[PDB]
Design a protein around this ligand. Structure first.
Ligand SMILES: CCCCCCCCCCCCCCCC(=O)OC[C@H](COP(=O)(O)OC[C@@H](O)CO)OC(=O)CCCCCCCCCCCCCCC
Ligand SMILES: CCCCCCCCCCCCCCCC(=O)OC[C@H](COP(=O)(O)OC[C@@H](O)CO)OC(=O)CCCCCCCCCCCCCCC
Ligand SMILES: CCCCCCCCCCCCCCCC(=O)OC[C@H](COP(=O)(O)OC[C@@H](O)CO)OC(=O)CCCCCCCCCCCCCCC
Ligand SMILES: CCCCCCCCCCCCCCCC(=O)OC[C@H](COP(=O)(O)OC[C@@H](O)CO)OC(=O)CCCCCCCCCCCCCCC
Ligand SMILES: CCCCCCCCCCCCCCCC(=O)OC[C@H](COP(=O)(O)OC[C@@H](O)CO)OC(=O)CCCCCCCCCCCCCCC
Ligand SMILES: CCCCCCCCCCCCCCCC(=O)OC[C@H](COP(=O)(O)OC[C@@H](O)CO)OC(=O)CCCCCCCCCCCCCCC
Ligand SMILES: CCCCCCCCCCCCCCCC(=O)OC[C@H](COP(=O)(O)OC[C@@H](O)CO)OC(=O)CCCCCCCCCCCCCCC
Ligand SMILES: CCCCCCCCCCCCCCCC(=O)OC[C@H](COP(=O)(O)OC[C@@H](O)CO)OC(=O)CCCCCCCCCCCCCCC
Ligand SMILES: CCCCCCCCCCCCCCCC(=O)OC[C@H](COP(=O)(O)OC[C@@H](O)CO)OC(=O)CCCCCCCCCCCCCCC
Ligand SMILES: CCCCCCCCCCCCCCCC(=O)OC[C@H](COP(=O)(O)OC[C@@H](O)CO)OC(=O)CCCCCCCCCCCCCCC
Ligand SMILES: CCCCCCCCCCCCCCCC(=O)OC[C@H](COP(=O)(O)OC[C@@H](O)CO)OC(=O)CCCCCCCCCCCCCCC
Ligand SMILES: CCCCCCCCCCCCCCCC(=O)OC[C@H](COP(=O)(O)OC[C@@H](O)CO)OC(=O)CCCCCCCCCCCCCCC
Ligand SMILES: CCCCCCCCCCCCCCCC(=O)OC[C@H](COP(=O)(O)OC[C@@H](O)CO)OC(=O)CCCCCCCCCCCCCCC
Lengths: 69, 69, 69, 69, 69, 69, 69, 69, 69, 69, 69, 69, 69, 69, 69, 69, 69, 69, 69
């Protein structure tokens, strides 16, 4: 019931599937970035940027719950 | 009665349902943005923009009541 | 009497009902706009536009009385 | 007498009643336009158009007397 | 009896058949959109648009029951 | 029977044929994009875009089943 | 038969012809890039970019088969 | 006999004649499009559009037999 | 006879005449493009675009025969 | 006769006249570029660009005959 | 006659007038450059750049005749 | 005799007179277009359009004889 | 006589009058463009555009006679 | 008489008035540009641009007479 | 009279008022620049730039009268 | 006499009266257009359009005498 | 008398009244533009546009008398 | 009386009310700009832009009276 | 009354609430900037920029009252 309960369930399923997919994408990104940095194509702060992005992505639900009260 | 009370109640129900749905959408957006920033596709101000948008969306009713007096 | 007093009363009732409905619509619009801005779909001037629109709509009667003298 | 004095009086009464009705319609129009502009459905020049229309309608008798001499 | 019970049954049958047909059309649309995005003919927000449209279409009956009360 | 089962079968046949055709189009697009990138006409994000598009197109039926429930 | 078998054959012929043409285009691009680099008009990463692009274009069918399953 | 067999034969003859005529028109269109693109009057997607149109027109009978079952 | 054989012959004559005219137009286009590029009004990719367009227009009949089977 | 022989002759006359005009335009362009480069407004690659453009424009007919076979 | 003889004459007049004007502009540029170099605002290669530019601009017609044959 | 020989002669006379008139109109149009282009009111492709139109209008009889056989 | 000789004479008079008027319009346009360029409102290619337009407008009759043969 | 002599006289009057007005506009532009350059808001080539624009606008009549012959 | 004498007078008034205002702006700019230079935020050439800009702005009318003759 | 002398005199009187009225309407139109342009509601070419229209209307009799001979 | 003197007087009265009204509208427009520019919503050329529009509207009668002679 | 006196009074009231409202909007804009500049989101010229806009807005009536004479 | 008094009160409330919110945002910005500067990600002038921005934002009302008189 409630009209949009079904859409909420679908969105929850989509969020779970995207969360499952994300670590593979992050690992592939890091694999490419490490070799790019080894080849003098990018700089060392790229690893810090990647770490910040991955840490933020990991706790996306917690941050959203903290902000969207 | 009052003619348009039923429409107002329907709009209230719609607002409640959209408010219930919104946190999932915000979490999915943040999850995507984290990986996008990790992969050097966007910039660091994206997180600030997301935080501002989510904070405004969380207090939409209060802001509307403050402005539409 | 006066021929069109009844129509004026009906219009006043309609105006009151629409004024009652409007804050919910404004809150829903702001809720959608916040998430749209979080996801990089719109820009920050949208909030300024929304604020101006809501402020104008809130004092519609006063502005009408000021201009239509 | 004068044949059309009665019709002129009826027209004057109708004009007065319509003038009484108009401000409510203008207020309702502005209330709708403000929310429409808040939701990105119209542009900012709509308010200028509304102001010009209301100002012209307010002084309809004076403009008619100035032109129809 | 009830005059329009037969017409309502026909409409329900048509709705069920259209609901059955829709997923194939959605899959074809997504298949075309993926290749169009791969070929640099459209943008990444097309997937978000498609997801929103499909989610709305899937819960059409629930949304109609929530609004048309 | 069921009125629209024939149209559903036709749509399924069309979907299967389009799925058969798609890999050739994707291969041609990738072949052109590789030479375009070698010639300094596009950037490296084109390959990521192509990969995302092809992956989404490949699992169109699964995504449609996940969302259109 | 099967509706789109003829179109699939035409697309396969087009793909084979484009694959035949591509090596000449890649060779001309490399010939121009080498002289441009000799004249201090481009940088040394251009050769890496060209190699990556040509390698990806060469195995376009294999990559498409790996991703579009 | 069958009443409309003669009309069907006339339609088949017209279809064969138009099918014979079309390749010349396609060649002329491509000849004009190549020069127009060389002179910076159109874009490179025009060739993709032309190829899709020609492939669809060539296998029109097969597609019609696949859809009109 | 064949009904439309005369129209086909007329189209062939028109195609031959346009093919005869085209090289002059291509030469004029390239003559203008060279001077425009000399004066810093356009970029160096214009020559690649022109070459692609002229090569495609030259073999328009062959491409049409390859695609329109 | 031949239908478009007159148009071809007109195009050849136009091409010859433009070829006659071009050297003056190239000389004026080089005269302006030299002074602009003397005043530190442009860089030394401008002369290479101008030389390439003028050389290409000089043999436009030969290049067109080479590519449009 | 010849169609573009008049335009060619106008272009020649413009070229002669610009050639007459140029030495004054070159002298002013050199006068400014000398003082700028005296005050440590530019480097000594500026004079070499100016000399190359002025020498190239002086023989613009001869270089154009050498290249545009 | 021949019934319509007189009408054909009248049409030929009208065609000759219109052909005599046209060059003046074309010259006036080009005179206006040049000034409009100088004043930044139109674009450079207007000259190409004008040239194509004038060339087609010049050999209208030849094209009509080539097509209407 | 000749039916349309009078219209041709009128058109010639109109063309002569427009040719007389044009130099004033060109001078005014250049006067405005120079100040606009001095005020950073347009770019330096505006002068090239103006010169091309004025030169074309000057020899409009000659170009018309060359193309419309 | 001469049909358009009156319009030509009006255009000459407008040109004279605009020529009278222009020096004030140029002076105001230079006054603003000097302070803008002092405040590090623009660059030093702005004065060269202004000088070129003013010199061109000053001799607009002479340039128009030289080109429009 | 003379049509645009009023506009010229208004422009002269605006020029005089801006000339009156400018010294205050120049003084404020120099006051900020001195402290910015003392704090190691800018370099010593800023004062030369400021002096050149102020000197040019002070004699804007004289330079305009010298160039716009 | 002459049947239509009276009608011609009436038309001449009407033309004189309309010519007397026109300047006021043109001034009002320009006054409105100036404010509309100041308010960013229209573009700068509106002034050119107005000037062309007013100049044409001013010499309407002369143009009519030139064309209608 | 003169038939249309009354309409001319009415138009003169309307012109005077609109001229009286205009300065208030111009002041309001400038007040809004200043705040919009301070809020980074528009650019600095808006003030130049406003000044030009107001100056043109101020001398509308003079410009009309200069052009409509 | 005078027809448009009432509209002028209404416009004066609107101008006074907007002038009263403006300082709050300017203060809010400055408050947001200061924090945005502190967070490295905008540059230091924004304060100069804001000051220019506010100074222009404050003396809107005086500038309108100076230009619209 | 006075029409826009209500809007002014709403704007004052919004300004007070934004002023209340601002110190937290400034503190968070400084907290992030300190760590960024510690990790060699930004320079030491960032603190000066932050101090200037915060000081300007703190006295926004006073500065607005000083400039907007
Ligand atoms: C003086 C030396 C200074 C620089 C040091 C290096 C100089 C010479 C280096 C020789 C390298 C030659 C080739 C290796 C390239 C290299 O060293 O760059 C490392 C490569 C990506 O690096 P980059 O992003 O820097 O590529 C070049 C760009 O920088 C050009 O802007 O990472 C890999 O995974 C290697 C892939 C090999 C290429 C084949 C790929 C085919 C399969 C993948 C396609 C699937 C589609 C989806 C993918 C997400
Ligand atoms: C040879 C050494 C040269 C460099 C020295 C340092 C190298 C190694 C540094 C190790 C750092 C590892 C991780 C610490 C990061 C660090 O040191 O960088 C400081 C960080 C911002 O740093 P950056 O802007 O430099 O990030 C990278 C950019 O430079 C990319 O260009 O400031 C913080 O607030 C730290 C937050 C921790 C990350 C987790 C955040 C999750 C919750 C917050 C999300 C809420 C959303 C809204 C927020 C407003
Ligand atoms: C690389 C990253 C760059 C971009 C960042 C985001 C990338 C990935 C984002 C994933 C989002 C997936 C889904 C969330 C969508 C999202 O993120 O966009 C926010 C959404 C609408 O915003 P948009 O303007 O972006 O909508 C799509 C447009 O982009 C179309 O062009 O607001 C919502 O309330 C979410 C609702 C979810 C959809 C279900 C709704 C069904 C019930 C409502 C119908 C009732 C009828 C009356 C309504 C008034
Ligand atoms: C020198 C290195 C410089 C660049 C660093 C990275 C280089 C190599 C990266 C390899 C990545 C390969 C693939 C991962 C892509 C990646 O790393 O980019 C992160 C991706 C979004 O990336 P972008 O917005 O940059 O996409 C490409 C655009 O930039 C094109 O302009 O976020 C994800 O969620 C990844 C999903 C994987 C793809 C499968 C999705 C299928 C199911 C979802 C569909 C449901 C519909 C609704 C959705 C809301
Ligand atoms: C420098 C690179 C910049 C661009 C990157 C790509 C360059 C080269 C691309 C090569 C593509 C060659 C051909 C593949 C085309 C391609 O890659 O574009 C993808 C195609 C449509 O894409 P577009 O939106 O670009 O179509 C043309 C538009 O651009 C027109 O403006 O989607 C498909 O399903 C492909 C079908 C192949 C054509 C045969 C279809 C016939 C049977 C179907 C008919 C049934 C009727 C009902 C249908 C629902
Ligand atoms: C100084 C160096 C800086 C830049 C590096 C390169 C400079 C010199 C490059 C020389 C290249 C010369 C020619 C090769 C072109 C090249 O290198 O660009 C790669 C080409 C597409 O390139 P672009 O999209 O950049 O084309 C020009 C556009 O950029 C215009 O803006 O991809 C191909 O498949 C090549 C095909 C050859 C052309 C013949 C095709 C005819 C048959 C196909 C038609 C069928 C219709 C349907 C199609 C789907
Ligand atoms: C501190 C030193 C650092 C920089 C060194 C130079 C600084 C001072 C230079 C003083 C120069 C002052 C004036 C000379 C200008 C100069 O030195 O720049 C050289 C000039 C064009 O140069 P630019 O393209 O650099 O012009 C400025 C541009 O850079 C603005 O973006 O070439 C000429 O032909 C000179 C014409 C003089 C202007 C009169 C022309 C009037 C008749 C022609 C119009 C016909 C229309 C159609 C034309 C195709
Ligand atoms: C202090 C030194 C610093 C710089 C070092 C070099 C300075 C002096 C160099 C002298 C070079 C003079 C001439 C050689 C040119 C040179 O060095 O540049 C190399 C040239 C392209 O170079 P760029 O891209 O740098 O061209 C100029 C651009 O940089 C403008 O931004 O590559 C070639 O293939 C050469 C062709 C010769 C030109 C004739 C071509 C005509 C027929 C081909 C056209 C067919 C159309 C289709 C094509 C795909
Ligand atoms: C710091 C320097 C930066 C810029 C470098 C150059 C600055 C100075 C250049 C001086 C050039 C002055 C005049 C030469 C113009 C020039 O150099 O630009 C090259 C010209 C066209 O160039 P554009 O497309 O750039 O024209 C202006 C456009 O850019 C406007 O957007 O090509 C020609 O054929 C020249 C013809 C001369 C004009 C007479 C033509 C009359 C007969 C033809 C009409 C027949 C109708 C049918 C036509 C198909
Ligand atoms: C971010 C900023 C971007 C936009 C800048 C401006 C924003 C704020 C502007 C405030 C304007 C408030 C009101 C002034 C309006 C304004 O500024 O627009 C200028 C006005 C007409 O302008 P528009 O064509 O833009 O009218 C509105 C159009 O947008 C309709 O779509 O011209 C006037 O004459 C003003 C008259 C005032 C209204 C009273 C007239 C009553 C008597 C006349 C009736 C006689 C009948 C016959 C007439 C021929
Ligand atoms: C910080 C510096 C950066 C930018 C540099 C400039 C900043 C300051 C400039 C001060 C300008 C103030 C006023 C001078 C204006 C100025 O400098 O712009 C130059 C003006 C036209 O310039 P624009 O096309 O740029 O006009 C503004 C447009 O850019 C708006 O988008 O040329 C003139 O002829 C001057 C006329 C003065 C206005 C009065 C005209 C009234 C009678 C004529 C009407 C007859 C109708 C028919 C006409 C054909
Ligand atoms: C390594 C460091 C490099 C960057 C330095 C800063 C990094 C970390 C900064 C942390 C900031 C976190 C959040 C504070 C945001 C911040 O610091 O940015 C300052 C904020 C807007 O600034 P921006 O233009 O940067 O906004 C985001 C844009 O950058 C997106 O492109 O100004 C404010 O007024 C703050 C309001 C707080 C947000 C809550 C508002 C909710 C109620 C008000 C809504 C009423 C509607 C009508 C309004 C007119
Ligand atoms: C190891 C040392 C190396 C660096 C030396 C200095 C280090 C420490 C310096 C401490 C300075 C702390 C504060 C003084 C600032 C300072 O020293 O910088 C000097 C300041 C401008 O400096 P900057 O342009 O460098 O500002 C920061 C920028 O560099 C950010 O990129 O000039 C002033 O007028 C100072 C005003 C004080 C701030 C209050 C202003 C509020 C009212 C005015 C607003 C009205 C709006 C319109 C205005 C036109």
């Amino acid at each position: 019931a409630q009209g949009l309960e079904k859409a909420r369930s679908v969105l929850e399923t989509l969020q779970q599937e995207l969360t499952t997919i994300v670590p593979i994408a992050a690992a592939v990104i890091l694999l490419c970035l490490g070799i790019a940095y080894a080849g003098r194509f990018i700089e060392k702060d790229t690893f810090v940027r990647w770490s910040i992005g991955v840490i933020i992505a990991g706790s996306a639900v917690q941050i959203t719950a903290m902000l969207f009260t």
